[PDB]
Design a protein around this ligand. Structure first.
Ligand SMILES: CCCNC(=O)[C@@H]1CCCN1C(=O)[C@H](N)C(c1ccccc1)c1ccccc1
Ligand code: NA
Lengths: 251, 27, 9
């Protein structure tokens, strides 16, 4: 996260770290959606241009974390993957369309003060909140700058951007399964996701029921916090049918 | 269920330092 | 710079 701030303790209890076993390193962010299911970006698990194709056994999920590097004894829980599910129409060749993946955990994780699932939006939630100018929140342990690493989880609040503005900022073909967020040059305020924040949640707090919903998944950008560029997010509600199908079949 | 309600915030009626900025944007 | 995690994992 570029131009964010240190998270408060328990501020993002659904935040998940995807951790590579060997070499031991941060792979991506992710989110907890129930006691056995974790959501992330497909490109965290499968991206042939970079020779990325992880299997279950290559990764661990670490839940309830704050410190990036510390083993948070008595606070974090480390879980093993039972199965990975990548959207079958994930477009890694072109534009990261449908950049979404689910991971089923071997055992349920116990909820705590630091570990708790985020809600997924329904149609009404999406319609009311996914509006230009409405702000959401993005969190992760990714780079602090484009071209280093935070000691603790970082947070930044960013406004959703009008679709014509998103399209005009980029040469990538934008789809309905994506939205963009970030401040414009004239707005003065800054912030963006960066390398290692991928797969992390973009969340909004409903003013109707005061619950946090995951509206987006950190998907792609062009640099980090560059003037005139925006961060792009997987549109969670647009893919909820696939999410539900997977959970209904395999849960 | 209890999704989206944080033990250290919503469940205790404590607000985090910047959630108000989100609310103020929901115009 | 990651601290080692328990062997159980
Ligand atoms: C914090 C987000 C991190 N996520 C990532 O790093 C992703 C992983 C794959 C590359 N990627 C990018 O964000 C590129 N940087 C992006 C791009 C490349 C060139 C010019 C404009 C956009 C891209 C967009 C769509 C398809 C391919 C590549
Ligand atoms: Na920008």
């Amino acid at each position: 996260i570029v131009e964010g701030s240190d998270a408060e303790i328990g501020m993002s209890p659904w935040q998940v770290m995807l951790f590579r076993k060997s070499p031991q390193e941060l792979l991506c962010g992710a989110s907890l959606i129930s006691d056995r299911w974790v959501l992330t970006a497909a490109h965290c698990l499968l991206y042939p241009p970079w020779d990325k194709n992880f299997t279950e056994n290559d990764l661990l999920v670490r839940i309830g974390k704050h410190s990036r590097t510390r083993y948070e004894r008595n606070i974090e829980k480390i879980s093993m993957l039972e199965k990975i599910y990548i959207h079958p129409r994930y477009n890694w060749r072109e534009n990261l369309d449908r950049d979404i993946a689910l991971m089923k955990l071997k055992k349920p994780v116990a909820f705590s003060d630091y570990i708790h699932p985020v809600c997924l939006p329904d149609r009404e939630t999406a319609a009311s909140l996914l509006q230009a100018g409405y702000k959401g929140r993005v969190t992760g342990w990714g780079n602090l700058k484009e071209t280093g690493q935070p000691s603790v989880l970082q947070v930044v609040n960013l406004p959703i951007v009008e679709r014509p503005v998103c399209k005009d900022s980029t040469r990538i073909r934008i789809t309905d399964n994506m939205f963009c967020a970030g401040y414009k040059p004239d707005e003065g305020k800054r912030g963006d996701a960066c390398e290692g924040d991928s797969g992390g949640p973009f969340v909004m707090k409903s003013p109707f029921n005061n619950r946090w919903y995951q509206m987006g998944i950190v998907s792609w950008g062009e640099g980090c916090d560059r003037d005139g560029k925006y961060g792009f997010y997987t549109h969670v509600f647009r893919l909820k049918k696939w999410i539900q199908k997977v959970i209904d079949q395999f849960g | 269920a209890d999704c989206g309600l944080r033990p250290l915030f919503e469940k205790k009626s404590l607000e985090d330092k910047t959630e108000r900025e989100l609310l103020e944007s929901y115009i | 710079d990651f601290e080692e995690i328990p062997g159980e994992y």
